[PDB]
């Protein structure tokens, strides 16, 4: 189902009108709070002293109805950026009045127009209103895909419509919004109500609106094509945009009068409900991911802290990771022990970081698959899960599995291993200190011993998302650096965002690492070709890993493992947003750093402009060893 409402600029009887639109199936109504034509004077007499009442009474609707059903609309005559001073001052006062009345009524949202380039004073007055009184209201900026000036019929003989292409000029509508929200200092209370015209603009200017706080889409009745049965429909490319917007879970606003007079009004709405019913049902990944969209998770301590019982439980339900791990061992055994040796050569397998034991069972299922004999050690640092392991081992596995309750970096092994199996990976591959762990463990791997996984690689891609930039910004806490929130990565199912260039490999680690002077510190420079105008807010992190040979896992979108919800992407924010023009190159630098006690990332942007070096020294975030 879609959440949707009716736009109106004419309300004769509030009680009747709301009834009619509710019967039509609309969840809410966009209406004016004062009469749209009722210009009011605030400064000079006699108009100043106009006898009231100034508008309708609040008593006409229930508190609940005001809170849930009514979206306020700024009077169209209110023009805070007029060239005329008198009009400017009056609109100022008028805007405050109307806004305050919305707040007084407790309306959930209130609409305001962006229909010209200069909205500087409108932004001021809005901003000032936001910092007066304590209210929760949301503000929807009505802004169209195509500026009304660029939609006009080519009918002014002496002033024709420029038919030449202007790449930036066709994007001018986004800049209207960008300037406005920048002036308003990215308030979480100012969102976008995007108007969709009859002719969709080129794809690039549509894409501009990716990562933007779109709460509403506006569909004028006029944009609807009619089918051979006389019913309202939309073009194939209009449907495209509707599907995109559906995923973004926006509310839909139907504006304008009925232009398909033969059928009831709910027909327009019925088409949206039809389109909503028609989108492809959620995939395996999207069933588990749903509810996590653009939700930020702080860096956790894989070593210094212990995972809760339910954390293990959720991740144990992965439909692919364990199957993949089983296969990786299965292939490795067959390679390590020939058919004629299937009873003379028993393979020593060590699960390093066993958790509650699923990789142990995966090792047992792989032995019976390959018809080979294995001896199992199950090493785990988390004494709490070591409870589950020892209970598994006594009740089920028996003497085949030795359970070891310690850190792998510390354990003194009775025998060396044929194969060390581990899953110590973060969203950015090595950000849960898998390299450091397996490094201090490879001394008890045989000189020809296989490590699973064999290698892993991190990937980075620059992103634009004013939404997520705002989420990070809101992560300021007392008693720490007021900007520390920007100098740490966040695990997040990135959703309302725009990838600005293709992911490129960042850091790679091999296991085993028999390199003489073992060093896990890194420094990598990356150059990202960007071919759209945009605003950079950070870098998305992904990883790929080779378990064994052609058996792999990936969260890198291009090569993503199907249905694998175990890892969300990571986000490296930047303190200040960076404007990027079409054709420019974003150059980022990432360092992996460490001392004996902790490991951390440091990063910076060097092109098109320089950022501050982020998290220097690990002042905001480190992972403890």
């Amino acid at each position: 189902r879609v959440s949707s409402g009716r736009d109106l600029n004419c309300v004769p009887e509030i009680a009747d009108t709301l009834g009619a639109v509710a019967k039509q199936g609309f969840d809410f109504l966009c209406m004016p709070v004062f009469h749209p034509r009722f210009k009011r004077e605030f400064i000079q007499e006699p108009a100043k002293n106009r006898p009231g009442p100034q508008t309708r009474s609040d008593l006409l609707l229930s508190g609940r109805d005001w809170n849930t059903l009514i979206v306020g609309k700024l009077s169209p005559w209110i023009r805070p950026d007029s060239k005329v001073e008198k009009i400017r001052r009056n609109s100022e006062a008028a805007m405050l009045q109307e806004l305050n009345f919305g707040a007084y009524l407790g309306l959930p949202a209130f609409l305001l127009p962006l229909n010209q380039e200069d909205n500087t004073n409108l932004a001021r007055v809005l901003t000032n209103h936001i910092h007066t009184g304590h209210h929760s209201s949301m503000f929807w900026m009505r802004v169209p895909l195509v500026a009304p000036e660029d939609l006009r019929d080519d009918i002014i003989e002496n002033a024709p419509t420029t038919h030449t292409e202007e790449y930036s000029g066709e994007e001018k509508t986004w800049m209207w919004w960008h300037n406005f929200r920048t002036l308003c200092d990215y308030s979480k209370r100012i969102a976008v109500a995007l108007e969709i015209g009859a002719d969709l603009p080129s794809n690039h200017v549509i894409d501009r609106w990716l990562g933007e706080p779109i709460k509403a889409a506006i569909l004028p009745t006029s944009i609807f094509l009619t089918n051979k049965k006389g019913f309202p429909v939309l073009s194939k490319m209009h449907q495209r945009l509707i599907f995109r917007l559906l995923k973004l879970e926006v509310q839909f606003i139907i504006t304008g009068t009925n232009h398909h007079s033969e059928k009831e009004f709910c027909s327009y709405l019925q088409y949206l409900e039809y389109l909503s019913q028609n989108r492809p049902p959620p995939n395996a990944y999207e069933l588990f991911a749903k509810g996590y969209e653009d939700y930020l998770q702080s860096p956790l301590q894989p070593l210094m802290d212990n995972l809760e019982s339910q954390t293990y439980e959720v991740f144990e339900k992965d439909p692919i990771k364990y199957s993949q791990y089983q296969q990786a061992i299965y292939k490795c055994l067959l390679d390590r022990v020939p058919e004629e040796e299937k009873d003379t050569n028993v393979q020593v397998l060590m699960v390093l970081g066993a958790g509650r034991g699923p990789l142990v069972n995966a090792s047992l299922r792989a032995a019976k698959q390959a018809d080979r004999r294995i001896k199992l050690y199950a090493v785990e640092k988390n004494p709490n899960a070591v409870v589950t392991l020892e209970n598994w081992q006594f009740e089920e596995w028996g003497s085949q599995v030795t359970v070891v309750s310690s850190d792998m970096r510390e354990w003194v092994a009775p025998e060396k291993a044929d194969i060390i199996v581990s899953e110590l990976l973060g969203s950015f591959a090595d950000n849960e200190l898998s390299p450091e762990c397996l490094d201090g463990a490879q001394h008890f791997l045989k000189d020809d011993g296989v490590s699973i996984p064999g290698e892993y690689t991190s990937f980075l891609a620059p992103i634009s998302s004013s939404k997520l930039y705002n989420e990070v910004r809101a992560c300021r806490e007392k008693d720490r650096d007021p900007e520390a929130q920007f100098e740490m990565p966040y695990v997040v199912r990135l959703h309302n965002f725009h990838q600005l260039s293709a992911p490129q490999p960042c850091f790679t680690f091999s296991h085993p690492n028999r390199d003489p002077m073992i060093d896990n510190n890194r420094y990598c420079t990356l150059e990202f070709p960007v071919e759209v105008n945009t605003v950079l807010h950070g870098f998305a992190g992904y990883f790929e890993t080779v378990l064994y040979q052609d058996i792999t896992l990936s969260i890198r979108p291009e090569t993503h493992s199907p249905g694998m919800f175990s890892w969300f992407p990571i986000l490296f924010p930047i303190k200040q947003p960076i404007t990027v023009r079409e054709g420019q190159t974003i150059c980022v630098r990432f360092w992996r750093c460490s001392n004996s006690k902790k490991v951390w990332y440091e990063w910076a942007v060097t092109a098109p402009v320089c950022s501050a070096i982020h998290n220097p020294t690990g002042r905001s975030y480190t992972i403890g060893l």
Binding site: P12, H35, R37, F38, P46, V84, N115, L151, G256
Partner: protein, 302 residues
Amino acid sequence: PACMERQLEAARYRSDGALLLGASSLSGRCWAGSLWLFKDPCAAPNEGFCSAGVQTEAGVADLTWVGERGILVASDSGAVELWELDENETLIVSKFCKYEHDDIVSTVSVLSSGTQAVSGSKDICIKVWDLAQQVVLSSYRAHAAQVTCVAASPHKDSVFLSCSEDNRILLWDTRCPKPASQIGPGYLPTSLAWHPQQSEVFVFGDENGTVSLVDTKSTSCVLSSAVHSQCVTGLVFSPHSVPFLASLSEDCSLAVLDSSLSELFRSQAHRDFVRDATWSPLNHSLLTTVGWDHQVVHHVVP
């Protein structure tokens, strides 16, 4: 109706001498409109002493006489509607009501013939109407902001003016394949009036209270004066041989100007916005103005 709405929007004298009134309710519980005929001009605006009256579903932004018994109404509902006057002239009945605009219809004008009309709305469009057949023959999206005022030429059926908050003043001619022509940043044009004799001359008032005199074929702004302190709401020429110009504003005042735009008369009679002005067909020195102060005032012009 037993009660007339507080906000008087328009006032027009018929050729026989009767007075038409458009009224809107811009505040209170119900936001609607009403139409009124007053065969006694001095009896206005009293509900008890009227010849006819009727409730409209929504407010009245603009209206005009269509001939002698037709009333063309620009509604808040986004509809243009025609009201037919009784042959008894005691009843007012709806003829057509067409929801064709997407926002408040803010301005209407009847073309010289009297069978076609032009409407301007906040939806930014301008539409051409066949009043006989009740349809839209032409729909023009020429402007970039809401259309403030449309004025049909006095004598040519295919020619009219329009002005909008997009700062454009458009001379129209539906005979050209590209109908509109831009007449040349001054403050936004708000009101239009053709010269009632010289079909090549018109006046326009801006939001800054300045009335300007324009020649179409010359397009070099001849003459202008700072008539008002606030936005010029309307402009109406007198039936006189050498005509006077009535100038109404939001400064709650009326002005009468000669053809050289010098101030002759001024009336503070209104204590709210002056909304329309109509000259008497019978006494050519008698001018009637309506306001939002619900006053109907009659002026003696020297």
